Amino acid sequence: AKHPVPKKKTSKARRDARRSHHALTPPTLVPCPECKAMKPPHTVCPECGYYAGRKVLEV
Amino acid sequence: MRHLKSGRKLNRHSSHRLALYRNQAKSLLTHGRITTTVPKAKELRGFVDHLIHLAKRGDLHARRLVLRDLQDVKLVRKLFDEIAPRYRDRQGGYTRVLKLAERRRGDGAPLALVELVE
Amino acid sequence: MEAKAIARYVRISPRKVRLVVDLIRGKSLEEARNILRYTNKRGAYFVAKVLESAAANAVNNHDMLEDRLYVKAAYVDEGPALKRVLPRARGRADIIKKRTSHITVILGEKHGK
Amino acid sequence: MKGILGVKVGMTRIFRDDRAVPVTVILAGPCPVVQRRTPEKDGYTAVQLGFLPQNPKRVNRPLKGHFAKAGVEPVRILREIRDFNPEGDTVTVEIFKPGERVDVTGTSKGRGFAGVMKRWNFAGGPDSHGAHKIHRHPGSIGNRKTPGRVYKGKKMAGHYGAERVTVMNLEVVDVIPEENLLLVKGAVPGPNGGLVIVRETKKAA
RNA sequence: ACCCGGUGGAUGGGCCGGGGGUGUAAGCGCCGCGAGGCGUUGAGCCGACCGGUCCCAAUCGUCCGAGGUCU
RNA sequence: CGAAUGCCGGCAUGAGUAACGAUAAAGAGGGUGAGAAUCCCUCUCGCCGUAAGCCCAAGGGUUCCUACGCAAUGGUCGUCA
RNA sequence: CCGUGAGGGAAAGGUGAAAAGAACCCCGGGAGGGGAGUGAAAUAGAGCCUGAAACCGUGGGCUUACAAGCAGUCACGGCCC
Ligand SMILES: [Mg+2]
Ligand SMILES: [Mg+2]
Ligand SMILES: [Mg+2]
Ligand SMILES: [Mg+2]
Ligand SMILES: [Mg+2]
Ligand SMILES: [Mg+2]
Ligand SMILES: [Mg+2]
Ligand SMILES: [Mg+2]
Ligand SMILES: [Mg+2]
Ligand SMILES: [Mg+2]
Ligand SMILES: [Mg+2]
Ligand SMILES: [Mg+2]
Ligand SMILES: [Mg+2]
Ligand SMILES: [Mg+2]
Ligand SMILES: [Mg+2]
Ligand SMILES: [Mg+2]
Ligand SMILES: [Mg+2]
Ligand SMILES: [Mg+2]
Ligand SMILES: [Mg+2]
Ligand SMILES: [Mg+2]
Ligand SMILES: [Mg+2]
Ligand SMILES: [Mg+2]
Ligand SMILES: [Mg+2]
Ligand SMILES: [Mg+2]
Ligand SMILES: [Mg+2]
Ligand SMILES: [Mg+2]
Ligand SMILES: [Mg+2]
Ligand SMILES: [Mg+2]
Ligand SMILES: [Mg+2]
């Protein structure tokens, strides 16, 4: 509401033509070492995922 | 630029950012394991390690230079008499950092874990 | 056979949700299930809930061998909005409209061939 | 036209006939000619070179150990020299006798998104008197209804630095063939460790 | 985006050595009624620079990706 | 009825953009919970302190206290109010 | 509801013939669905007759990344029905 303003109502085309990028990507997942559960890499997985320094397990 | 500089600015100013670390420290050396944002941790290492290494060499001057950051006699005590030991034959990395796979909700902050190795 | 599970009037803005309802269209309910669990978006949650619900309907009502069905179709629809008032500077006042979604998630049976 | 590659050690003033100062140590390590692009099979004349040896095998396939000199292929064979034809094997460093003149070509320092007035030295605004949130702006950029556009080359802010830059006629102060070392006259681009190349001065020769 | 690493590895953090910046820490001893001064001591502390070192972390894996139209 | 910067209603565009209301400031552990950066507890840190603390008057009119609860209200969250 | 006040002054009607208003089971904290059941009819399910248009979608056919655009029209050509 002021100085610069939209000259024309953008076309439905150009609108979605710019959102051609907002397309969301799928996470990056990998199988946990032990439990046959799926989980994102380099992370002390939500099911006892890791060895040595406590793996904040589900025990 | 703002090239070869090293040392996260944590959307905090001097006295805050500093007094922040001293509080991460006190926690970490009382509970042995703390959970924070991955970054807030990646920094905590060196601040603590130092505190600990100053503990091994542990004499009087070390007891004090260390106290300056913890202010608490006890704990400062528990660190020199029960923590320092466990590391006397370990040179470096007296601290660990392990990323968590879940993010704080209604915020979405990537988390991590911090425990004293060994 | 197929089984749907529509979550009506979910207080949340469509364009925000369609985002994820797009991450699981046509996938292994095992795949989907996973993706959602690990997707940083309020929407994830709501879609999951529905998804997991048609999963149940699949089993319980239409006999479908859980471990053999995918997301044949999914898609969220626009529901009546909530016109609230947002006071502005110089006695302006505006109508902020809290939208609401209608999330549909229908299931189908994978090959078996 | 003598080529050669080298990182860029550091800087430091020296001393010669009193009149101290002022060089840029840079090492033109052994550069194993790994190809010699012919004006028949290629159309022009040059010599792929290769630098830093290394690579205990990060070297995929292509590699090109073909030319029996590809000693565990260098990290950056990057670049040939052009109109250069060595002693068909490894460029010395002694290709340079002191007193000679050169040209260093390097990757300049990366200044990211740079405001105008660094990127171009624009005068900026007036720190006081009127002022008002234009203390560092580019001021005006065009005329009115005619032209009604902005010049194809109109200076403005943007990526600035981290571009291939060449500084010429640099005097070759010295050279230690033992350590592949080479000393010049400060004016040499890029950061330390970044790669640079050293030709013979285009000034004449 | 680009570039370099990812343990058959010195990538970052710690640690050690060196640069470098401060100006000779605390404790103790001595001199002074005392503020102080002297010594131990160029000490102590010490970001970013140059290196060394697997003590901490780059674990484990996953997904893409040609099989070449016609005279 | 196609135009009146027409009237009423509805839905678009700018746009996932500007914002989210003092730069006094946060950190962690443990609870509860279907669900916690946001609720309870404890330790640490910071802010006001001729108030950012207390007592009156006006005005307000149940906002007080307690039990059970989150659709909406709270500029996010909410098990809290 | 607006205004100190005189005064201004809205929006908002319809399930079915009869509540027969959806037992019970399943997912879910709920809301909400899926079955089941009522009904002639359930896109008659209570933010309920008919439910148009803007506007937001999902799927399919044709089409498009060397192209200059009041967006049509007139020709030929492919592809789909
Ligand atoms: Mg930096
Ligand atoms: Mg201060
Ligand atoms: Mg006002
Ligand atoms: Mg830079
Ligand atoms: Mg000026
Ligand atoms: Mg100003
Ligand atoms: Mg003008
Ligand atoms: Mg390292
Ligand atoms: Mg040192
Ligand atoms: Mg002393
Ligand atoms: Mg080694
Ligand atoms: Mg007319
Ligand atoms: Mg209108
Ligand atoms: Mg914009
Ligand atoms: Mg912006
Ligand atoms: Mg913003
Ligand atoms: Mg606020
Ligand atoms: Mg009340
Ligand atoms: Mg109360
Ligand atoms: Mg809320
Ligand atoms: Mg508000
Ligand atoms: Mg609760
Ligand atoms: Mg309560
Ligand atoms: Mg039902
Ligand atoms: Mg009807
Ligand atoms: Mg009727
Ligand atoms: Mg109707
Ligand atoms: Mg074409
Ligand atoms: Mg035409």
Which residues of B, range 42-61, sit inside 8 Å of A by Cβ? none
> If we measure between CA atoms, which residue out of D132, D124, D196 comes closest to residue D164?
D196
Q: Which tokens hold the place of D49?
A: 């070179």
Distance CA D163, CA A49 (A): 46
- Phi/psi at C55 (5° precision): -55, -50
Residue C106 CB contacts under 8 Å (≥ 6 apart), including other chains: C2, C3, C4, C5, C54, C71, C72, C73, C74
Structural domain C2-110, CATH architecture? Alpha-Beta Complex (3.90)
Range A5-25 burial, b when 16+ CB lie within 10 A, else e: eeeeeeeeeeeeeeeeeeeee
Q: Are residues B55 and B79 in contact, defined by beta-carbon separation less than 8 angstroms?
A: yes
Q: Is C37 on the interface with B (CB under 8 A)?
A: no
**Helix C42-62 crosses helix C29-37 at what angle (to 10 degrees)?**
150
Longest CA–CA span in chain B (Å) reads: 47
In-domain check, residue B8:
no
Q: Do chains A and B touch (3 or more CB pairs under 8 A)?
A: yes
Cβ(D91)–Cβ(D4) below 8 Å: yes
Nearest Cα to Cα of residue D174 among D67, D21, D57, D18 = D21
How many Å lie between the alpha carbon of C106 and the closest alpha carbon of chain B?
Answer: 28
Q: Is the CB of A40 under 7 A from strand E?
A: no
Chains with ≥3 CB–CB distances under 8 Å to B: A, C, D
Ligand 22 mean position, distance from CA A10 (Å):
46
Within 10 Å of residue D106's Cβ, how many Cβ atoms? 20
Q: Are D90 and D177 in contact (CB under 8 A)?
A: no
User: Residue B69 pairs with which residues in a beta bridge?
Assistant: none
Minimum CA–C1' distance nucleotide for C74: G58
Would you list the domain boundaries of chain C?
2-110
Least Cα separation, residue D128 to chain B (angstroms): 27
Nucleotide nearest to C100 in CA–C1' terms: G56
D113 has which bridge partners? Answer: D159
Whether B26 maps to a domain, the answer reads yes
Q: Which residues of B touch D111 (CB under 8 A)?
A: 1
Q: What does the block give as tokens for C92?
A: 């302006």
In a domain, B84, yes or no: yes
The three-class DSSP label of residue C78 is strand
Residue B3 in tokens: 């090239």
Is the CB of A39 less than 8 angstroms away from the CB of B99? no
Residue D85: C-alpha distances to residues B115, C39, D4, D45 (Å): 61, 59, 12, 8
Compute the radius of gyration of chain B from its Cα atoms: 15
3-state secondary structure string across chain D = CCCCEECCCCEECCECCCCECCEEEEECCCECCCCCCCCCCCCCCCCCCCCCCCCCCCCCCCCCCCCCCCCCCCCCCCCCCCCCCCCCCCECCCCCCCCCEEEEEEECCCCCEECCCCCCCCCCCCCCCCCCCCCCCCCCCCCCCCCCCCCCCCCCCEECCCCEEEEEEEECCEEECCCCEEECCCCCCCCCCCCEEEEECCCCC
Q: What tokens were used for B44?
A: 């905590």
Chain A contact present for B65, CB below 8 A: no
Pairing of strands C94-109, B33-37: unpaired
3-class SS of residue B68: helix
Provide the resolution (angstroms).
Answer: 3.2
Cα gap D146→D134, rounded to integer Å: 25
Return contacts of C80-89, CB within 8 angstroms, 24+ apart: C80/C9, C82/C11
If one counts the domains in chain B, the total is: 1
Contacts of D30 (CB under 8 A, 6+ apart): D90, D91, D92, D93, D180
User: Residue type at B27?
Assistant: S
Q: Which of D82, D91, D97, D100 is nearest to D169 (CA)?
A: D100
Contact B38, B25 (CB under 8 A): no
Domain that holds residue B118: 14-118
Residue B59's CATH number: 3.90.1030.10
Judge contact between D34 and D48, C-beta under 8 A. yes
